[PDB]
């Protein structure tokens, strides 16, 4: 979607792998604000939100 | 009332306590108020921060 219409979409109820994320060298910026990068896969969350 | 004197001091000594013990809960402007919460987040750069 575009800026103005930005895209939200809920993800509840899944086990996620974010060392796929980290390895894979397709982004340019993999910038994280509250919480380090390497940690993600040792973390429980809810409200997750992309 | 009659042992007021004592009372005072036991009841300034535990509320000096519960007022340290309850001083634990702040995050004095940090992201968080327990230790183990920012150890389990964050990397030790801004961690130390």
Known sequence: ?50 | SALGKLQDVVNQNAQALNTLVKQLSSNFGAISSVLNDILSRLDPPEAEV
């Open chain 1, 1 to 50: 979607a575009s800026v103005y219409a930005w895209n939200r979409k809920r993800i509840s109820n899944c086990v996620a792998d974010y060392s796929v994320l980290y390895n894979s060298a397709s982004f340019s910026t993999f910038k994280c604000y509250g919480v380090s990068p390497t940690k993600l896969n040792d973390l429980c969350f809810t409200n997750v939100y992309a």
